[PDB]
Amino acid sequence: MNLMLALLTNFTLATLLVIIAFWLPQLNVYSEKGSARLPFSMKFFLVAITFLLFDLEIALLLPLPWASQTANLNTMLTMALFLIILLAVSLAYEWTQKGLEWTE
Amino acid sequence: ATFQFLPDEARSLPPPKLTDPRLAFVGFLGYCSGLIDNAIRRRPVLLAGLHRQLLYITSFVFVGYYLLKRQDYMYAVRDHDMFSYIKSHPEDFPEKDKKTYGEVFEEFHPVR
Amino acid sequence: PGIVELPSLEDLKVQEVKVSSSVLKAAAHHYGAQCDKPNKEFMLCRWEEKDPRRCLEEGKLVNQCALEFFRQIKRHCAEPFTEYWTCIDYSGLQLFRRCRKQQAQFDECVLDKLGWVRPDLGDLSKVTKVKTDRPLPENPYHSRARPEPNPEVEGDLKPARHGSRLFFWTM
Amino acid sequence: MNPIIFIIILLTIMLGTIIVMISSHWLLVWIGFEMNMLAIIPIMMKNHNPRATEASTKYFLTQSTASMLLMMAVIINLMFSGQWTVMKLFNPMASMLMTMALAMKLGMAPFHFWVPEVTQGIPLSSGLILLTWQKLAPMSVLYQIFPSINLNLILTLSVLSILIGGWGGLNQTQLRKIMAYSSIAHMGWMTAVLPYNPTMTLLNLIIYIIMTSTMFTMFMANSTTTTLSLSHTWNKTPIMTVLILATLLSMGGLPPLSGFMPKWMIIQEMTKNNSIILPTFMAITALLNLYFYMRLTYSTTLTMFPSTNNMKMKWQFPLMKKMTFLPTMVVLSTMMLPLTPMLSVLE
Amino acid sequence: VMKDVPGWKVGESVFHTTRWVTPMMGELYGLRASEEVLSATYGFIWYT
Amino acid sequence: AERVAAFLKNVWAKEPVLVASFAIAGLAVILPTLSPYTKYSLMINRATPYNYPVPLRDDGNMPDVPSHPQDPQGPSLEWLKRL
Amino acid sequence: PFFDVQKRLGVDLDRWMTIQSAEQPHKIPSRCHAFEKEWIECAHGIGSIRAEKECKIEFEDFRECLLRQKTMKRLHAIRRQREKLIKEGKYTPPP
Amino acid sequence: AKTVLRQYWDIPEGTECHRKTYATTSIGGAAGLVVSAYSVALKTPTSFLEGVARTGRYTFTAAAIGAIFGLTSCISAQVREKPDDPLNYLIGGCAGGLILGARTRSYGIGAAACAYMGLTAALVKMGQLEGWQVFAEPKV
Amino acid sequence: MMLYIVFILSVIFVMGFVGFSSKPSPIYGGLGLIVSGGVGCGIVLNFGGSFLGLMVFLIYLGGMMVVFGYTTAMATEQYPEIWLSNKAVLGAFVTGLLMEFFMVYYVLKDKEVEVVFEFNGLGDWVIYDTGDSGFFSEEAMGIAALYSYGTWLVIVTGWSLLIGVVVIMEITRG
Amino acid sequence: MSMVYMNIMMAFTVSLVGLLMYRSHLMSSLLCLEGMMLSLFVMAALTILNSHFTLASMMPIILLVFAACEAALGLSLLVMVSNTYGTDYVQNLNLLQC
Ligand SMILES: CCCCCCCCCCCCO[C@@H]1O[C@H](CO)[C@@H](O[C@H]2O[C@H](CO)[C@@H](O)[C@H](O)[C@H]2O)[C@H](O)[C@H]1O
Ligand SMILES: CCCCCCCCCCCCO[C@@H]1O[C@H](CO)[C@@H](O[C@H]2O[C@H](CO)[C@@H](O)[C@H](O)[C@H]2O)[C@H](O)[C@H]1O
Ligand SMILES: CCCCCCCCCCCCO[C@@H]1O[C@H](CO)[C@@H](O[C@H]2O[C@H](CO)[C@@H](O)[C@H](O)[C@H]2O)[C@H](O)[C@H]1O
Ligand SMILES: CCCCCCCCCCCCO[C@@H]1O[C@H](CO)[C@@H](O[C@H]2O[C@H](CO)[C@@H](O)[C@H](O)[C@H]2O)[C@H](O)[C@H]1O
Ligand SMILES: N=C(N)NC(=N)NCCc1ccc(I)c(Cl)c1
């Protein structure tokens, strides 16, 4: 219940500050004074997609602090290094294929 | 067994003869493949690359022999299973009482 | 289906050990050593029977031993123990390692006044053996009789009679 | 595509299929399909043109939808049996969902619309994979879950596929669309017999793959993708025209050729089960396939269509395409009927 | 509660087996004040 | 030996960040197999008792099973106290 | 599996996670462990055609543990009766 | 489709004509609705009303055939006093063919439909009499 | 009551789905999915799945949905169309909410409902487990077992992710 | 079944109908595909957590990881479609009509 209250307070206050920031006295009485390819490089797509794939790999590494408590440490250490090495191979592939370049 | 091409129990069966007519046909198919290989590449059909034609026959025969071994084993297993089941359930496979045609009545249908 | 058989409310009555979790934590190590025998008998019963209704009497003896154990502490070492579990209770995680001075006083009191020796690291996690008069359950799962296995094909493998017998093929 | 990358991508298409075939866990089956779909897309896209991009997108949408439905079937099965083992499902709604998902993956009617379009939009070598190797994994799951499939559903899919495949092929001049509708028709025979004898499903699948690979390989050999382009073969490689004729007649189920064997065996199994109307209806409807196979033989082998003058320049050069295994496959595609009893190895 | 409900055996198991079965929350706290049910069901999950 | 030494000096001068990465990754793969302490990580993980140690019914022929936790039979954590 | 490579090589690729009564970390049991164990042992080796009939009792109990449909229905019955009596004043719950 | 087919095949032939005609009209109408659904889905109508018109034209046409087959086949069996006769169904099937020759207005289609729907209807009656299985249950 | 928190969250879950499934502007459709994701995490949280709940936030919302919004801004919609401005979207949106409200109202009035299949309406708490006193998270034990038990899963998962990198570089090179 | 399952299955059905009923944007259809994944993740997680199937606790993660990789492939196809035609409208993908 506490976490819900904290979240509700944080965003309710944020909402109140935003609305009052928009509606304050102004003291004036007169009249006040689409879905296409945005010209944006394919390189920026590849960054976001590259981030996603690395983020999915990170999801698999997150259990590592708990996995190190296993008695099957031989298997666990081999699989941890395998996953990270494969992540490094992914980076090496993008790097050597000019996927990390910003020219052209 | 389990994921076994020829289980150990297949070794109790007589192997296919090396002069099996089905194995001769398999060798003949390999020979035909050798000739078609020459034809599609516009070589002299009968004479070109006898070394290649020899391996076509040998490869077909070699694989055909093991396929024929597995084929005969599977049919031996089908018969083994069938007879053992007939024994296990004698109530479902009784010996029919046989009557001679002197006793059996058959209607006669003249052709006139 | 049948009626779920339950014991009577009076069949479940027993003196309860109404002390807080920090009190139990402070006494846990000596309690494990002192009341091991009735405790292990009860836990053997629970794992063998897989039924809480079948080990109620063993559970009453667990309570009795715990009460007598805490009556001995109260008689002899009430003051060092009170200082010790009160130190445990302050911690939000009830950490042993923040109360070693008070633990030493309590430990030194039970050793002199009762001969209680605190078990060593690793001892209370040992698997021990229990001598019980209770019969060993025979069908604790209440399993029905298993279906008979399929009749087992056996004999000598012979060539198929007349071959594949597929339509006109003679082999 | 870098040749080493091409090899690794091809090996991953195969690995995804193999994972499906060796898995005993529904999650690993689902992974195999996902891995397989990931690796197939690049080979559909490899010639970089709007038609290839449209084909890959239509393929992605169909296969991803089917894989979500498969996952839903797996999860319903988990709730109603508490286990993941690949076998009969323990809920009729799960069985329907998995059957529909596998039908979409196979391109069976009425989920067939993607097959002619995707096959048309990708290169011949990619179409060969799509219509042969890609049928292995979904068929290998049907092989295992069939004890729980709804009989009326599976036979309705089979009948619709044979009808749609036969009718759809009558109106085609593009070779890739002909093979696509032919594939839809042949999937119908494979699944029609599945409830009765899955071994005949495997036999029809294997013979289908051999014959389909032979046709695609002969089309690749001459770089032909249309009926008229194929009609020039007689003036360049006469031997090829004869091999196409034999393979097409075999694909038409004519005895004494190989392609008669699956229809023969499937009719036998169905009649043993007192299914008489369905096999007869199936066999007559398959004459539609024979018709548009025969049309191709007419324009390829049995008559000589007009040529062009530049064709003479082609006379001075030899065929350089690999045509891997073509001599072996064409012999199997046509001359296997005398070895029909060999099907028992598939038991 | 079920004294005058026809064909209702009181305390009848829903399982064929006579083995002891651990009850679920609804069986234990089926007829108790919501304050205790909420604490039993979501107290641990919600504790800070 | 020398051509490799001339290779390392070049990457050390040009790509010290990558040389350090590969060096650390190699040590992460190799050192566990060489370390004499690696065997203790297995033992400590197994010595942590997460669930109750269910006692065994005594059939009269288990002389290696302690009757009491403070008896001298069964695994000892003396090795761990020193470590 | 279509090709039972796992059993041929004696290697466990995914069998470990197929059922909830298999070995679990730290011997944590599933809620329906005993019911799944009983059903699996009843149906073992006799084939699914036979098991669908001969092990219906174990499977029905296992399904009841899985989804608790019969238990919830019974609880719904007792609660509904209690509301009526509260709505008619013939029942006052104890403390 | 199961229950509707169960009502129809429960009524004895040559009797309860109004119930037989209702069962076939519902069967025919449902087939018309299915055809309309696919037709509208795959060949998009130029407007909302064209699509509704197409649904009515197809559904009414299919219900018209279903009604005429049921009535004519039940009237024939009743009048001739032959319940278990495939000829009655052959008569009703051709009547349906004529209707399909009228809704599409094509003497050729009507003649072809009557022969083929007439033959198909007779085979259905024979199958019911003799236990022919279309989707046969696996047995061996 | 807070005894129906899981049910209430699942009601919002469905409303978010009817939101983007009616397919408004992909910008607003993305918002509906983000709200559904957060509500879906709360549902998983209340069943004792803390890690699984936070993975939805970390990976599904902070990962995949960010890339969806990023891609939408680039190659789809740069400025949203007014929400519910199209009649088809409004009809679909209203229809799903009307169906949902009826399910909720009927299951709450009778404490059970038969929408195709029959469901119980007593509250989800009734099926919860009644005996937990272990010194660890069981969900954490299971996920940590990926590295001891799931060697095969790690291999095929890691391989697919690497191939995903190679594949997407092939697709996009054009 | 439990009350929560009513709405989770409803969410999957709603997203499936959304997926099968296209409008114009391909991205809108890709969002429905992710919606089905999210409902599958919740339904699987609830079933696994409630039943205390301990080793199955990793399965929803594997589902999430693989389906996100699928979505990345789907997005890459969308941008290639958008590069060709300037929009992600499905009506432009009708060349293979003939
Ligand atoms: C000690 C083992 C520790 C485990 C390490 C974990 C796995 C990491 C795998 C990374 C593999 C990268 O492999 C890398 O490939 C490219 C090939 O173009 C090589 O780099 C090469 O291409 C670049 C251009 O990009 C040239 O400028 C350079 O002269 C050349 O060396 C790198 O020298 C090599 O390091
Ligand atoms: C691209 C593929 C990348 C794959 C990378 C795989 C790299 C694996 C490197 C480490 C593998 C071995 O790592 C370590 O080796 C020693 C061997 O001395 C093992 O053995 C050590 O621990 C075990 C405990 O199980 C003790 O019983 C043993 O006495 C001790 O020697 C360790 O259990 C293991 O943790
Ligand atoms: C395209 C790439 C293809 C690469 C193919 C590589 C295949 C790798 C197979 C890995 C599985 C090997 O075989 C399997 O491994 C694990 C760990 O070693 C073992 O599992 C071990 O760890 C956990 C601990 O509880 C349990 O699974 C089990 O108690 C224990 O035996 C299995 O008992 C063994 O059957
Ligand atoms: C150009 C020709 C095109 C192909 C034509 C194919 C015709 C195939 C024949 C139709 C199939 C047989 O039709 C089906 O037979 C079975 C017989 O068990 C009937 O079985 C019926 O028997 C009993 C009493 O008789 C009924 O109460 C019950 O409703 C139903 O089970 C079905 O009501 C009928 O629908
Ligand atoms: N499922 C079916 N209907 N058919 C089937 N496989 N029947 C099993 C009978 C059989 C037949 C041939 C062989 I060789 C073997 Cl060993 C066994």
From TrEMBL, chain A:
InterPro entries noted in UniProt: NADH_UbQ/plastoQ_OxRdtase_su3, NDAH_ubi_oxred_su3_sf
Reaction it catalyzes: a ubiquinone + NADH + 5 H(+)(in) = a ubiquinol + NAD(+) + 4 H(+)(out)
GO CC, alphabetical: mitochondrial inner membrane; respiratory chain complex I
GO molecular function, one term: oxidoreductase activity
GO biological process, one term: mitochondrial electron transport, NADH to ubiquinone
Entry keyword NAD: yes
Keyword annotations of the record: Electron transport, Membrane, Mitochondrion, Mitochondrion inner membrane, NAD, Oxidoreductase, Respiratory chain, Translocase, Transmembrane, Transmembrane helix, Transport, Ubiquinone
Enzyme Commission numbers on file: 7.1.1.2
Top-level EC class: translocase
Membrane topology: Multi-pass membrane protein
Membrane spanning residue stretches: 44-64, 76-93
Keyword Lipid biosynthesis in record: no
Compartments where found: Mitochondrion inner membrane; Mitochondrion membrane
PANTHER family: NADH-UBIQUINONE OXIDOREDUCTASE CHAIN 3
UniProt family annotation: Belongs to the complex I subunit 3 family.
Function: Core subunit of the mitochondrial membrane respiratory chain NADH dehydrogenase (Complex I) which catalyzes electron transfer from NADH through the respiratory chain, using ubiquinone as an electron acceptor. Essential for the catalytic activity of complex I.
Binding partners and assembly: Core subunit of respiratory chain NADH dehydrogenase (Complex I) which is composed of 45 different subunits. Interacts with TMEM186. Interacts with TMEM242.
Protein name stated in the entry: NADH-ubiquinone oxidoreductase chain 3
Organism of derivation: Bos taurus (Bovine)
Source species taxonomy: Eukaryota, Metazoa, Chordata, Craniata, Vertebrata
Gene name of this polypeptide: ND3
